[PDB]
Amino acid sequence: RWIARTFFDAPEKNYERTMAILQIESEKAELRLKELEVRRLMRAKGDGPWFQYPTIDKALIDHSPKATPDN
Amino acid sequence: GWVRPDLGELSKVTKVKTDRPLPENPYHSRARPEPNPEVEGDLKPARHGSRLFFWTM
């Protein structure tokens, strides 16, 4: 009684604690495989935010009316 | 007649009317790039931290 109650923790506390750690690192591992999937896909699709290599900016094209002959 | 215009003959960019409707989509005028969706929405702290081989928070 003395030993157990003062120095230790119930199989309750430890047990459910392990339940929580398995929650945490579980969902981590899952989401790691997710990000490997994502970044794997991004170089092919180039859709989303991660991989962007800036082209030349359209901001300056000089739309102004120019020397008439053409273009 | 014909008064001579001299130094005021030109520049002064002229305004003119034409019956023909202005050309739209001049020269090639292709389709648009279908731009990429911009990042939106409130974002909260990340989940459990660096996610690395270890190092939680």
Tab-separated table of N, CA and C in Angstrom:
chain	number	residue	atom	x	y	z
A	1	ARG	N	0.833	-1.200	0.000
A	1	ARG	CA	0.000	0.000	0.000
A	1	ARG	C	0.867	1.249	0.000
A	2	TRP	N	1.795	1.341	0.952
A	2	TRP	CA	2.661	2.511	1.030
A	2	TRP	C	3.411	2.733	-0.276
A	3	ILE	N	4.218	1.744	-0.675
A	3	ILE	CA	4.995	1.834	-1.910
A	3	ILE	C	4.111	2.265	-3.064
A	4	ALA	N	3.113	1.441	-3.378
A	4	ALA	CA	2.267	1.689	-4.536
A	4	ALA	C	1.709	3.102	-4.530
A	5	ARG	N	1.085	3.511	-3.427
A	5	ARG	CA	0.352	4.768	-3.479
A	5	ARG	C	1.296	5.960	-3.542
A	6	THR	N	2.418	5.916	-2.825
A	6	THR	CA	3.251	7.113	-2.837
A	6	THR	C	4.168	7.175	-4.058
A	7	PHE	N	4.806	6.064	-4.433
A	7	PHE	CA	5.886	6.106	-5.413
A	7	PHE	C	5.484	5.798	-6.847
A	8	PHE	N	4.291	5.287	-7.098
A	8	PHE	CA	3.973	4.810	-8.436
A	8	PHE	C	2.719	5.487	-8.962
A	9	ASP	N	2.324	5.069	-10.156
A	9	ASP	CA	1.142	5.575	-10.825
A	9	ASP	C	0.333	4.388	-11.321
A	10	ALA	N	-0.987	4.519	-11.280
A	10	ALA	CA	-1.858	3.406	-11.609
A	10	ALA	C	-1.611	2.927	-13.039
A	11	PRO	N	-1.924	1.669	-13.338
A	11	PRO	CA	-1.917	1.226	-14.738
A	11	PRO	C	-2.863	2.059	-15.586
A	12	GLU	N	-3.806	2.712	-14.914
A	12	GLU	CA	-4.664	3.719	-15.514
A	12	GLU	C	-3.835	4.793	-16.197
A	13	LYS	N	-3.124	5.558	-15.374
A	13	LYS	CA	-2.368	6.715	-15.830
A	13	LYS	C	-1.401	6.342	-16.947
A	14	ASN	N	-0.539	5.358	-16.692
A	14	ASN	CA	0.390	4.893	-17.716
A	14	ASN	C	-0.344	4.455	-18.972
A	15	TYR	N	-1.281	3.532	-18.823
A	15	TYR	CA	-2.060	2.985	-19.922
A	15	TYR	C	-2.612	4.064	-20.845
A	16	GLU	N	-3.522	4.885	-20.330
A	16	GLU	CA	-4.107	5.923	-21.168
A	16	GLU	C	-3.061	6.896	-21.679
A	17	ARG	N	-2.009	7.147	-20.897
A	17	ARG	CA	-0.905	7.943	-21.415
A	17	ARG	C	-0.389	7.356	-22.719
A	18	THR	N	-0.129	6.049	-22.728
A	18	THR	CA	0.295	5.409	-23.963
A	18	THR	C	-0.762	5.556	-25.039
A	19	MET	N	-2.035	5.559	-24.654
A	19	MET	CA	-3.063	5.813	-25.653
A	19	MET	C	-2.848	7.174	-26.305
A	20	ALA	N	-2.495	8.181	-25.503
A	20	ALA	CA	-2.308	9.527	-26.034
A	20	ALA	C	-1.074	9.613	-26.919
A	21	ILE	N	0.068	9.108	-26.444
A	21	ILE	CA	1.261	9.130	-27.286
A	21	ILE	C	0.995	8.425	-28.607
A	22	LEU	N	0.238	7.328	-28.581
A	22	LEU	CA	-0.054	6.655	-29.838
A	22	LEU	C	-0.963	7.497	-30.724
A	23	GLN	N	-1.899	8.237	-30.132
A	23	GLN	CA	-2.593	9.257	-30.905
A	23	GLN	C	-1.587	10.145	-31.614
A	24	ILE	N	-0.825	10.913	-30.837
A	24	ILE	CA	0.118	11.891	-31.365
A	24	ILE	C	0.958	11.312	-32.486
A	25	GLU	N	1.862	10.403	-32.143
A	25	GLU	CA	2.804	9.961	-33.150
A	25	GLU	C	2.102	9.212	-34.265
A	26	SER	N	0.942	8.626	-33.983
A	26	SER	CA	0.152	8.054	-35.059
A	26	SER	C	-0.143	9.101	-36.117
A	27	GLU	N	-0.929	10.114	-35.750
A	27	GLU	CA	-1.336	11.081	-36.757
A	27	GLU	C	-0.130	11.765	-37.371
A	28	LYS	N	0.950	11.948	-36.609
A	28	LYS	CA	2.163	12.441	-37.252
A	28	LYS	C	2.559	11.555	-38.417
A	29	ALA	N	2.862	10.285	-38.156
A	29	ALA	CA	3.296	9.409	-39.239
A	29	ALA	C	2.370	9.519	-40.440
A	30	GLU	N	1.060	9.436	-40.199
A	30	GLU	CA	0.123	9.566	-41.309
A	30	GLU	C	0.400	10.827	-42.104
A	31	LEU	N	0.433	11.965	-41.422
A	31	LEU	CA	0.574	13.224	-42.135
A	31	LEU	C	1.948	13.373	-42.788
A	32	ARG	N	2.965	12.663	-42.296
A	32	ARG	CA	4.238	12.627	-43.002
A	32	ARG	C	4.080	11.960	-44.354
A	33	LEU	N	3.463	10.777	-44.377
A	33	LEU	CA	3.204	10.153	-45.668
A	33	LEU	C	2.381	11.071	-46.562
A	34	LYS	N	1.470	11.847	-45.968
A	34	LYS	CA	0.743	12.831	-46.762
A	34	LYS	C	1.695	13.816	-47.427
A	35	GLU	N	2.571	14.461	-46.649
A	35	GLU	CA	3.395	15.497	-47.265
A	35	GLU	C	4.348	14.915	-48.294
A	36	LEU	N	4.862	13.705	-48.068
A	36	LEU	CA	5.659	13.081	-49.117
A	36	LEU	C	4.832	12.891	-50.381
A	37	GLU	N	3.559	12.523	-50.228
A	37	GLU	CA	2.690	12.404	-51.394
A	37	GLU	C	2.549	13.745	-52.105
A	38	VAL	N	2.264	14.801	-51.344
A	38	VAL	CA	2.070	16.147	-51.869
A	38	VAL	C	3.292	16.583	-52.658
A	39	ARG	N	4.411	16.763	-51.957
A	39	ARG	CA	5.623	17.246	-52.604
A	39	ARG	C	6.046	16.339	-53.745
A	40	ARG	N	5.758	15.042	-53.639
A	40	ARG	CA	5.956	14.156	-54.777
A	40	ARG	C	5.140	14.615	-55.975
A	41	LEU	N	3.900	15.035	-55.736
A	41	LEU	CA	2.998	15.378	-56.825
A	41	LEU	C	3.257	16.772	-57.378
A	42	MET	N	3.790	17.669	-56.554
A	42	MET	CA	3.854	19.076	-56.929
A	42	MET	C	4.788	19.309	-58.109
A	43	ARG	N	5.936	18.632	-58.145
A	43	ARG	CA	6.829	18.824	-59.282
A	43	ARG	C	6.163	18.434	-60.592
A	44	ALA	N	5.267	17.452	-60.566
A	44	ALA	CA	4.548	17.106	-61.785
A	44	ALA	C	3.475	18.136	-62.114
A	45	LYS	N	2.597	18.440	-61.156
A	45	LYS	CA	1.484	19.327	-61.474
A	45	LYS	C	1.888	20.794	-61.451
A	46	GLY	N	2.751	21.184	-60.519
A	46	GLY	CA	3.069	22.587	-60.364
A	46	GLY	C	1.910	23.465	-59.957
A	47	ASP	N	0.774	22.878	-59.594
A	47	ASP	CA	-0.413	23.635	-59.226
A	47	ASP	C	-0.173	24.559	-58.040
A	48	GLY	N	0.037	23.980	-56.866
A	48	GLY	CA	-0.133	24.693	-55.623
A	48	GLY	C	1.015	25.574	-55.184
A	49	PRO	N	1.033	25.877	-53.888
A	49	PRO	CA	1.916	26.938	-53.384
A	49	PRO	C	3.395	26.594	-53.322
A	50	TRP	N	3.774	25.328	-53.121
A	50	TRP	CA	5.162	25.045	-52.751
A	50	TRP	C	6.143	25.373	-53.866
A	51	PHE	N	5.951	24.810	-55.048
A	51	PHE	CA	6.930	24.949	-56.116
A	51	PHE	C	6.467	26.042	-57.067
A	52	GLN	N	7.151	27.179	-57.017
A	52	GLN	CA	6.899	28.298	-57.912
A	52	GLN	C	8.241	28.889	-58.298
A	53	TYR	N	8.512	28.965	-59.589
A	53	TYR	CA	9.735	29.590	-60.079
A	53	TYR	C	9.347	30.812	-60.892
A	54	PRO	N	9.585	32.022	-60.395
A	54	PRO	CA	8.943	33.203	-60.981
A	54	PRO	C	9.342	33.424	-62.430
A	55	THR	N	8.337	33.604	-63.280
A	55	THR	CA	8.566	34.039	-64.643
A	55	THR	C	8.834	35.536	-64.652
A	56	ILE	N	8.960	36.097	-65.836
A	56	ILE	CA	9.173	37.530	-65.950
A	56	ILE	C	7.851	38.249	-65.750
A	57	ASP	N	7.899	39.378	-65.052
A	57	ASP	CA	6.688	40.043	-64.599
A	57	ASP	C	6.066	40.857	-65.725
A	58	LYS	N	4.767	40.644	-65.942
A	58	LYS	CA	3.993	41.407	-66.908
A	58	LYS	C	3.793	42.854	-66.482
A	59	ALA	N	4.143	43.201	-65.241
A	59	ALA	CA	3.906	44.553	-64.748
A	59	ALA	C	4.406	45.599	-65.730
A	60	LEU	N	5.640	45.462	-66.186
A	60	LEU	CA	6.177	46.336	-67.218
A	60	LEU	C	6.131	45.559	-68.522
A	61	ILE	N	5.134	45.848	-69.353
A	61	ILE	CA	5.208	45.501	-70.765
A	61	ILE	C	5.248	46.721	-71.670
A	62	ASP	N	5.063	47.922	-71.125
A	62	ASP	CA	4.897	49.145	-71.909
A	62	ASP	C	3.784	48.993	-72.953
A	63	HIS	N	2.542	48.992	-72.464
A	63	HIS	CA	1.396	48.925	-73.368
A	63	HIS	C	1.248	50.155	-74.253
A	64	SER	N	2.054	51.192	-74.047
A	64	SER	CA	1.779	52.496	-74.631
A	64	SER	C	1.678	52.426	-76.154
A	65	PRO	N	0.906	53.323	-76.762
A	65	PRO	CA	0.941	53.456	-78.221
A	65	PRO	C	2.345	53.805	-78.682
A	66	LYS	N	2.817	53.096	-79.699
A	66	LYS	CA	4.214	53.150	-80.103
A	66	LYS	C	4.330	53.665	-81.527
A	67	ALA	N	5.560	53.650	-82.043
A	67	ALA	CA	5.774	53.974	-83.444
A	67	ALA	C	4.842	53.123	-84.287
A	68	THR	N	4.083	53.785	-85.158
A	68	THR	CA	2.897	53.158	-85.730
A	68	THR	C	3.133	51.896	-86.563
A	69	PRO	N	4.240	51.724	-87.319
A	69	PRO	CA	4.187	50.795	-88.463
A	69	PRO	C	3.512	49.471	-88.179
A	70	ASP	N	3.757	48.875	-87.017
A	70	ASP	CA	3.297	47.541	-86.647
A	70	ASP	C	3.701	47.272	-85.208
A	71	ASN	N	3.051	46.273	-84.621
A	71	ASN	CA	3.432	45.710	-83.333
A	71	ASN	C	3.587	46.769	-82.245
B	1	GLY	N	-5.749	80.634	-101.244
B	1	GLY	CA	-5.824	80.508	-99.801
B	1	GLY	C	-4.716	79.654	-99.215
B	2	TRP	N	-5.067	78.778	-98.271
B	2	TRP	CA	-4.118	77.936	-97.546
B	2	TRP	C	-3.149	78.728	-96.681
B	3	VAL	N	-3.638	79.297	-95.580
B	3	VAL	CA	-2.732	79.807	-94.562
B	3	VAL	C	-1.752	78.705	-94.172
B	4	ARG	N	-0.487	79.074	-94.012
B	4	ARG	CA	0.543	78.098	-93.668
B	4	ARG	C	0.496	77.780	-92.177
B	5	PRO	N	0.493	76.501	-91.796
B	5	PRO	CA	0.362	76.156	-90.373
B	5	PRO	C	1.594	76.453	-89.545
B	6	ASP	N	2.778	76.453	-90.160
B	6	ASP	CA	4.102	76.572	-89.547
B	6	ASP	C	4.288	75.592	-88.389
B	7	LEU	N	4.962	76.034	-87.326
B	7	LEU	CA	5.402	75.146	-86.258
B	7	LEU	C	4.261	74.490	-85.492
B	8	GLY	N	3.017	74.880	-85.741
B	8	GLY	CA	1.896	74.238	-85.088
B	8	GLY	C	1.152	73.263	-85.975
B	9	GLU	N	1.803	72.781	-87.036
B	9	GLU	CA	1.096	71.934	-87.994
B	9	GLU	C	0.758	70.577	-87.397
B	10	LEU	N	1.574	70.094	-86.470
B	10	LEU	CA	1.485	68.708	-86.044
B	10	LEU	C	1.852	68.604	-84.577
B	11	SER	N	2.140	67.375	-84.170
B	11	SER	CA	2.069	66.928	-82.784
B	11	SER	C	0.613	67.167	-82.389
B	12	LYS	N	0.337	67.632	-81.170
B	12	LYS	CA	-1.040	67.877	-80.761
B	12	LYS	C	-1.907	66.710	-81.202
B	13	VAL	N	-1.742	65.559	-80.548
B	13	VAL	CA	-2.211	64.297	-81.103
B	13	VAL	C	-3.675	64.409	-81.502
B	14	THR	N	-3.953	64.090	-82.760
B	14	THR	CA	-5.224	64.437	-83.373
B	14	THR	C	-6.319	63.466	-82.948
B	15	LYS	N	-7.541	63.979	-82.820
B	15	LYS	CA	-8.706	63.146	-82.558
B	15	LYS	C	-9.504	62.952	-83.839
B	16	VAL	N	-9.871	61.705	-84.126
B	16	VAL	CA	-10.559	61.361	-85.363
B	16	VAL	C	-11.638	60.323	-85.076
B	17	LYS	N	-12.722	60.391	-85.844
B	17	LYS	CA	-13.817	59.435	-85.805
B	17	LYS	C	-13.698	58.439	-86.951
B	18	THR	N	-14.085	57.191	-86.684
B	18	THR	CA	-14.196	56.168	-87.714
B	18	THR	C	-15.441	55.330	-87.485
B	19	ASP	N	-16.125	54.997	-88.577
B	19	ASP	CA	-17.336	54.196	-88.480
B	19	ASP	C	-17.031	52.735	-88.186
B	20	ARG	N	-15.906	52.227	-88.677
B	20	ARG	CA	-15.560	50.836	-88.439
B	20	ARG	C	-15.409	50.594	-86.940
B	21	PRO	N	-15.941	49.496	-86.420
B	21	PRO	CA	-15.759	49.205	-84.997
B	21	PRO	C	-14.327	48.800	-84.717
B	22	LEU	N	-13.841	49.200	-83.550
B	22	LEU	CA	-12.464	48.905	-83.197
B	22	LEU	C	-12.249	47.395	-83.177
B	23	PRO	N	-11.079	46.917	-83.590
B	23	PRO	CA	-10.793	45.483	-83.488
B	23	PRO	C	-10.605	45.071	-82.037
B	24	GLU	N	-11.212	43.952	-81.675
B	24	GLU	CA	-11.079	43.383	-80.346
B	24	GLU	C	-10.244	42.115	-80.437
B	25	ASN	N	-9.541	41.813	-79.349
B	25	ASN	CA	-8.623	40.687	-79.304
B	25	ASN	C	-7.636	40.843	-80.450
B	26	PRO	N	-6.874	41.934	-80.482
B	26	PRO	CA	-6.061	42.221	-81.663
B	26	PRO	C	-4.975	41.183	-81.830
B	27	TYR	N	-4.584	40.988	-83.083
B	27	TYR	CA	-3.644	39.948	-83.508
B	27	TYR	C	-4.064	38.632	-82.848
B	28	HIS	N	-3.138	37.851	-82.294
B	28	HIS	CA	-3.429	36.460	-81.966
B	28	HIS	C	-4.460	36.361	-80.851
B	29	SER	N	-4.157	36.952	-79.694
B	29	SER	CA	-5.094	37.073	-78.578
B	29	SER	C	-5.661	35.707	-78.180
B	30	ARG	N	-4.790	34.908	-77.575
B	30	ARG	CA	-5.112	33.527	-77.245
B	30	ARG	C	-5.884	33.436	-75.929
B	31	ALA	N	-6.046	32.212	-75.439
B	31	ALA	CA	-6.689	31.924	-74.169
B	31	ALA	C	-5.762	32.250	-72.997
B	32	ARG	N	-6.363	32.349	-71.815
B	32	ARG	CA	-5.736	32.730	-70.560
B	32	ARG	C	-5.079	31.543	-69.866
B	33	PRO	N	-4.121	31.808	-68.972
B	33	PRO	CA	-3.344	30.721	-68.357
B	33	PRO	C	-4.110	29.829	-67.389
B	34	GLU	N	-5.325	30.196	-66.957
B	34	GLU	CA	-6.002	29.499	-65.863
B	34	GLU	C	-5.152	29.611	-64.601
B	35	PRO	N	-5.123	30.791	-63.977
B	35	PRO	CA	-4.176	31.042	-62.884
B	35	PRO	C	-4.424	30.157	-61.674
B	36	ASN	N	-3.413	30.100	-60.810
B	36	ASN	CA	-3.395	29.190	-59.679
B	36	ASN	C	-4.119	29.793	-58.480
B	37	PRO	N	-4.767	28.957	-57.671
B	37	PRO	CA	-5.506	29.477	-56.515
B	37	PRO	C	-4.562	30.053	-55.471
B	38	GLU	N	-4.889	31.250	-54.995
B	38	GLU	CA	-4.093	31.910	-53.976
B	38	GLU	C	-4.460	31.377	-52.595
B	39	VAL	N	-3.499	31.454	-51.678
B	39	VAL	CA	-3.672	30.946	-50.321
B	39	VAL	C	-4.633	31.843	-49.555
B	40	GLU	N	-5.552	31.225	-48.815
B	40	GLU	CA	-6.632	31.940	-48.151
B	40	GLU	C	-6.863	31.348	-46.770
B	41	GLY	N	-7.656	32.051	-45.977
B	41	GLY	CA	-8.159	31.509	-44.725
B	41	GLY	C	-7.207	31.724	-43.568
B	42	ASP	N	-7.786	31.826	-42.373
B	42	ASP	CA	-6.988	31.920	-41.160
B	42	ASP	C	-6.253	30.611	-40.930
B	43	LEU	N	-4.970	30.706	-40.606
B	43	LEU	CA	-4.157	29.539	-40.314
B	43	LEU	C	-3.635	29.618	-38.885
B	44	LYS	N	-3.712	28.490	-38.190
B	44	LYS	CA	-3.407	28.346	-36.775
B	44	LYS	C	-2.015	27.734	-36.647
B	45	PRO	N	-1.460	27.552	-35.444
B	45	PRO	CA	-0.131	26.943	-35.353
B	45	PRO	C	-0.130	25.551	-35.955
B	46	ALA	N	1.061	25.094	-36.329
B	46	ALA	CA	1.148	23.805	-36.986
B	46	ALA	C	0.850	22.707	-35.976
B	47	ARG	N	0.806	21.472	-36.450
B	47	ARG	CA	0.330	20.366	-35.631
B	47	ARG	C	1.525	19.574	-35.117
B	48	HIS	N	1.753	19.646	-33.806
B	48	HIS	CA	2.756	18.880	-33.077
B	48	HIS	C	4.181	19.287	-33.417
B	49	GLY	N	4.380	20.286	-34.272
B	49	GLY	CA	5.709	20.830	-34.456
B	49	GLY	C	6.468	20.279	-35.638
B	50	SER	N	7.795	20.260	-35.529
B	50	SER	CA	8.652	19.997	-36.677
B	50	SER	C	8.354	18.686	-37.376
B	51	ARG	N	7.667	17.752	-36.722
B	51	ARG	CA	7.256	16.495	-37.335
B	51	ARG	C	8.453	15.616	-37.650
B	52	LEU	N	9.656	16.060	-37.324
B	52	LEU	CA	10.888	15.442	-37.779
B	52	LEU	C	11.059	14.087	-37.087
B	53	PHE	N	12.211	13.448	-37.315
B	53	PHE	CA	12.483	12.118	-36.775
B	53	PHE	C	12.177	12.048	-35.289
B	54	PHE	N	12.259	13.189	-34.616
B	54	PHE	CA	11.773	13.405	-33.257
B	54	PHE	C	11.526	14.907	-33.137
B	55	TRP	N	11.669	15.458	-31.933
B	55	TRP	CA	11.455	16.890	-31.725
B	55	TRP	C	9.995	17.285	-31.805
B	56	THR	N	9.218	16.974	-30.781
B	56	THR	CA	7.846	17.456	-30.696
B	56	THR	C	7.860	18.808	-29.999
B	57	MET	N	7.489	19.856	-30.728
B	57	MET	CA	7.314	21.186	-30.149
B	57	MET	C	8.570	21.676	-29.446
